[PDB]
Ligand binder design. Structure first.
Ligand SMILES: OC[C@H]1O[C@H](S[C@H]2[C@H](O)[C@@H](O)[C@@H](O[C@H]3[C@H](O)[C@@H](O)[C@@H](S[C@H]4[C@H](O)[C@@H](O)[C@@H](O[C@H]5[C@H](O)[C@@H](O)[C@@H](S[C@H]6[C@H](O)[C@@H](O)[C@@H](O)O[C@@H]6CO)O[C@@H]5CO)O[C@@H]4CO)O[C@@H]3CO)O[C@@H]2CO)[C@H](O)[C@@H](O)[C@@H]1O
Ligand SMILES: [Ca+2]
Ligand SMILES: [Ca+2]
Length: 684
């Protein structure tokens, strides 16, 4: 199928996601509504259930609300069964309407629908070309108190009805009993409770297996993507292992939520996006956009700076999910924020790199500050707002123009209030001009672009006061950009030479099937390169002009570049593809008596690519932890490592550029065939 079809579960670059709180959208079936105190028919007390369900989503898909809006994917609340109990937090009654208080990841939330309703949602969605993305929260169950089992449901977990265990009397150690996190460090936030939510101990073999089994269930039902909640509060190692099991079974686009407060680069965040096997919600992009269009605390330069900085930090910037707001912050729209600014932020987001997501109601200019006010009921289904118009005209461009879906970004003109950028991919180009100044127009002179000679019409049709331009070999004739204007000019044409636009997933073991999207691959089965290794014939399960499904060859584990050769012509190289040694398992490495010097950290490396292949650089594992599970001078770290393999490893201390290794022989350990394990050694 073409890279743009609904069947492409590995790439969302050509899509526009619509994030919706299932309970706050449409109550299509009042028969499944909760009873009593947990329900509010008027939906005025936003902490209670309002009745929204999967039937309501089905209805709006059938009457073409989403089709006319232009969205091609739906991101819904966690579908799993949540606790039924009601919780009173200092006077106010709270319910699990948000879906984050799971109790059984193998059953559906009765209030949203049955297992059958869910299947019906998938079918109905796919029939109209809409992908379904689900929220999944494997970090915890629900609120719990160890001393009081009568609080909520004591964070109890069920395996399709069968009780696995609760927070109190957790003899098996399914959860962490290290208190609540104070967010003082990364380690503190991973092994301690997120508020009062019972934290899972993924090192426990049962919990590890439970989540691999539980996710397969939903993948088997046809979900096209996964939004992993609180990725910053679970070990990267376990998550990478979990991700490889997903990719070996049914690869789907997966991204996580790692909260960031500014557009500033964050080392840990960058590492996660580059090493976990999944991408992230682009909080840096979000901050810049809000600072510039909403809050007026930054100018266009901050926007351009962020575009360049993020493109440099993330290996695959096109996999990051962008947005102007969501359930974790104030609604973009405020009384002090103009409609045009909201509209410009949307246009910018929809034409920029990454995978754009729209929080439900944005098209209706919904207001609401903080939790829960920002999760109000959908006020209307009108298709007449300007914002609705902008989305319907720009969203389709991600499918029709590869420059917008896979292209690079270059600044063509800029000043405090004006920004003109260019998206380019092969011969296809897209140019967007934005003037955030609401009162004064701007005279643009000396603008150059890659647009071929010709006359260009504003894709928006002037709804955002856009204008038409004339290109003379890229040189655009002088023009006036109206106050608060924003225009989109583009040019698309067929590509003759092979060009890779996206590869998904970007991690896997030999035998897994990866998807290569792009242009000009031709219909004749060619050859795929993973470094220097050529992959041909049967190994290439599918080959079309815009997409190539290929099997990962049995080469040495490591970092590889991917190229495609069609009719003797070599395409561009898609860098940083990770090939694993084989199936993964999470192992906790513990080392005793590793006393260090001020500012000196402990790292780990060994004889497999997953351990860095004896490297002491960015591929080495670390820095190790030393506060929560084990205390200094004992260090520890959870690492995704190959299953059933004899490993050789050593720890090393690194302060500045001085590296001091362990003496003696290398430590050895044979990893288990599956699950988890703990290996403890003494510093030599
Ligand atoms: O005693 C403390 C506290 O007790 C309760 S809080 C109570 C709340 O009243 C309920 O509404 C309910 O809240 C749940 C919420 O409704 C659900 O949607 C989820 S939220 C989920 C987030 O989506 C996810 O992002 C993450 O949380 C992240 C935050 O979103 C993000 O902003 C930051 S928090 C960061 C702040 O920005 C800073 O301002 C500063 O405070 O430092 C903070 C450091 O993190 O990062 C977070 C983690 O990445 O995870 C949450 C958890 O699911 O669940 C909510 C919790 O269930 O339930 C809570 C308690 O369970 C009292 O009501 C309150 O007054 C009191 O302060
Ligand atoms: Ca209902
Ligand atoms: Ca945790």
């Amino acid at each position: 199928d073409p890279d743009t079809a609904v069947t492409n579960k590995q790439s969302f670059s050509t899509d526009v996601i619509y994030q919706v709180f299932t309970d706050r959208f449409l109550d299509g079936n009042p028969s499944n509504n909760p009873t009593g105190a947990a329900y509010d028919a008027t939906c005025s007390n936003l902490k209670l259930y309002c009745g929204g369900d999967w039937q309501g989503l089905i209805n709006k898909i059938n009457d073409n609300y989403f089709s006319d809006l232009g969205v091609t994917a739906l991101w819904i609340s966690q579908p799993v069964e949540n606790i039924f109990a009601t919780i009173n937090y200092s006077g106010v009654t709270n319910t699990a309407y948000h879906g984050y208080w799971a109790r059984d990841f193998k059953k559906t939330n009765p209030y949203f629908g049955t297992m059958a309703d869910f299947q019906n949602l998938i079918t109905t969605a796919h029939a109209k070309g809409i992908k379904i993305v689900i929220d999944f929260a494997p970090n915890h169950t629900s609120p719990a108190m160890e001393t009081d089992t009568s609080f909520a449901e004591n964070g109890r977990l069920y395996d399709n009805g069968t009780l696995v265990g609760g927070y109190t009397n957790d003899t098996n150690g399914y959860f962490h009993h290290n208190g609540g996190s104070d967010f003082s460090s990364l380690e503190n936030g991973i092994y301690k409770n997120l508020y009062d939510l019972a934290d899972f101990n993924h090192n426990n073999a049962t919990i590890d297996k439970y989540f691999k089994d539980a996710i397969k269930l939903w993948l088997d039902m046809g979900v096209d993507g996964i939004r992993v909640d609180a990725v910053k509060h679970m070990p990267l190692g376990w998550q990478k292992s979990w991700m490889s099991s997903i990719y070996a079974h049914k690869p789907v686009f997966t991204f996580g939520a790692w909260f960031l407060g500014s557009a500033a680069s964050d080392a840990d965040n960058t590492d996660f996006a580059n090493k976990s096997g999944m991408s992230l919600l682009d909080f840096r992009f979000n901050s810049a956009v809000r600072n510039v269009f909403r809050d007026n605390t930054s100018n266009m330069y901050a926007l351009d700076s962020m575009i360049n900085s993020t493109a440099t930090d993330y290996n695959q910037v096109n996999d990051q999910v962008t947005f102007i707001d969501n359930h974790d912050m104030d609604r973009f729209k405020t009384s002090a924020v103009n409609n045009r600014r909201l509209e410009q932020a949307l246009a910018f987001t929809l034409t920029s790199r990454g995978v754009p997501a729209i929080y439900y109601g944005t098209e209706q200019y919904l207001t609401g500050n903080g939790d829960p006010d920002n999760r109000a009921k959908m006020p209307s289904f009108s298709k007449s707002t300007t914002a609705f118009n902008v989305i319907s005209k720009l969203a389709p461009l991600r499918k029709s123009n590869p420059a917008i879906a896979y292209g690079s970004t270059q600044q063509r003109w800029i000043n405090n209030d004006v920004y003109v950028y260019e998206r380019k991919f092969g011969k296809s180009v897209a140019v967007v001009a934005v003037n955030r100044n609401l009162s004064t127009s701007a005279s643009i002179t000396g603008l150059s672009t890659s647009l071929p000679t010709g006359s260009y019409t504003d894709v928006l049709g002037g709804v955002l006061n856009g204008n038409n331009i004339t290109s003379t070999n890229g040189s655009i004739n002088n023009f006036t950009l109206a106050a608060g204007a924003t225009a989109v000019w583009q040019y698309t044409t067929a590509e003759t030479t092979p060009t890779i636009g996206h590869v998904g997933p970007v991690m896997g073991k030999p035998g897994n099937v990866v998807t290569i999207d792009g242009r000009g691959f031709g219909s004749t089965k060619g050859t795929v390169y993973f470094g220097t290794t050529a992959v041909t014939g049967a190994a290439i399960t599918s080959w079309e002009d815009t997409q190539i499904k290929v099997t990962i060859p049995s080469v040495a584990a490591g970092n590889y570049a991917v190229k495609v050769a069609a009719s003797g012509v070599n395409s561009n190289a898609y860098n940083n593809f990770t090939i694993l040694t084989g199936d993964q398992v999470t192992v906790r490495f513990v080392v005793n008596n590793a006393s260090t010097t001020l500012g000196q950290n402990l790292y780990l490396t060994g004889n497999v690519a997953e351990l860095g292949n004896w490297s002491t650089g960015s591929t080495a594992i670390g820095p190790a932890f030393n506060q929560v599970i084990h205390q200094y001078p004992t260090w520890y770290y959870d690492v995704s490592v190959p299953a059933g393999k004899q490993l050789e490893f050593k720890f090393f201390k690194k302060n500045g550029s001085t590296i001091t290794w362990e003496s003696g022989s290398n430590h050895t350990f044979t990893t288990p065939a599956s699950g988890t394990a703990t290996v403890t050694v003494n510093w030599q």
